[PDB]
Design a binder for these strands. Structure first.
Length: 32
RNA sequence: UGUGGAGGGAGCCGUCGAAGGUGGGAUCGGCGAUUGGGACGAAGUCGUAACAAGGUAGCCGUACCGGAAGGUGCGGCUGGAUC
């Protein structure tokens, strides 16, 4: 088993997560 | 025998009636000032996060935080090394 794969996975996950932290307001108070 | 009679038609009325209109909706596309992140880039800036115990072992899930890689906490795994 390697960890390169899991790391690329992890990075995509993290960037999407931080994007959601930054847009937690706009998503809610836009898409109603 | 007579403008007689059935009877029929014209004509008219009603049912159904396409197209035309009104109506608020569905669905499908396009545009959209601005805003995202995605790929590639020549060559550059910021750092050293990772690979050897990568110099704080990494990694999974989650929460918080941070200029950025990332850091810390709780639990877990070895796909973790020496003795």
């Amino acid at each position: 088993g390697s960890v390169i794969k899991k790391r690329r996975k992890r990075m995509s996950k993290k960037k999407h997560r931080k994007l959601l932290r930054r847009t937690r307001v706009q998503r809610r108070k836009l898409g109603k």
